[PDB]
Amino acid sequence: MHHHHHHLVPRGSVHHIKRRDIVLKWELGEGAFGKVFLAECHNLLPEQDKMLVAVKALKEASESARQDFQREAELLTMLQHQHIVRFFGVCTEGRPLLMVFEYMRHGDLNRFLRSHGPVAPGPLGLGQLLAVASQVAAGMVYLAGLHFVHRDLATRNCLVGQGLVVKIGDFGLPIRWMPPESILYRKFTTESDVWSFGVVLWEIFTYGKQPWYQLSNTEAIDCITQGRELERPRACPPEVYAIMRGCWQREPQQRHSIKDVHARLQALAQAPPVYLD
Ligand SMILES: CC(C)(CO)n1cc(C(=O)c2cncc(NC(=O)Cc3ccc(Cl)cn3)c2)c2cnc(N)nc21
């Protein structure tokens, strides 16, 4: 499951949280081998007696799932960045096994885009869409620096917190976001992540529409393998579509680097182009 991350070596142990320090509130979601709950966590941070967290309750104990649990936990404690999901630790006393994360008040980015399109309610402006895109790019720069290949970058895997802070996570094939080499040869690299970032940019600028929405899963696969490009969204300025095309070069070595994509987005976010659809 995490074999592709073998070159990543943990410096230290995972933070352990006492079961009695976690107080479950209600389910936030479910899918990837477990339910996610909102909860209160006591004695986690020094200043606050209690705070809200998101808790994933693991469904199994194969015990290949318990082996994957420990490795995943060791990997997540290593990921520490402003735009990467914040992992607090595990609870191993009893069953089910628990993983504790930061609670992100506005939920997933896909639902956030869909509800703020066609917190302050209303449609997100160009400046706000660029700010979202720059934050996701910042997280991807961090992952590329760690030699961490995400493999499933998509807005459904991003979270929105207080003050529109965006963080990348993975809530558990995403063919529509993949380049041809990932679909055909299961080749997942920093370069296939940059392609998915380009698709994330397309999702942002379409307010969360599914890529290749006019096509069946089969038609979408053939279409990506043949080299057809996603159309420019109506809300997308020409400067931003140039970034998408850079992420979508057929040759992985020709794709723009995430450092350059992030730098370009920072420039656009700081001074948005005067663009009107
Ligand atoms: C929107 C839902 C309800 C969806 O479950 N939701 C999940 C929250 C999590 O924090 C979360 C839940 N389960 C698993 C993880 N694991 C990682 O993200 C692993 C990882 C991989 C790669 C990288 Cl680069 C970083 N991290 C995270 C969360 C938090 N708040 C809210 N409101 N909803 C959440």
113 phi, psi to nearest 5 deg: -60, -50
50, 41 Cβ separation under 8 angstroms: yes
- PDB experimental method: X-ray
Q: And the tokens for 80?
A: 């520490």
Dihedral in degrees, nearest 10, Cα atoms 261, 264, 268, 270: 110
Domains along the chain? 1-103 (3.30.200.20), 104-277 (1.10.510.10)
**Rounded to whole angstroms, how far apart are CA atoms 121 and 119?**
6
Distance 222 CA to ligand 1 centre (A): 31
| Cβ of residue 107 lying under 6 Å from some atom of ligand 1 | yes
181 phi, psi to nearest 5 deg: -65, -25
Exposure string over 24-41, b if 16+ CB within 10 A, otherwise e:
eeeebeeeeebbbbebbb
From the CB of residue 118, how many other CB atoms can be counted at a distance below 10 Å?
9
Dihedral in degrees, nearest 10, Cα atoms 121, 125, 127, 131: 50
Known active-site residue 21: no
| Cβ of residue 161 lying under 6 Å from some atom of ligand 1 | no
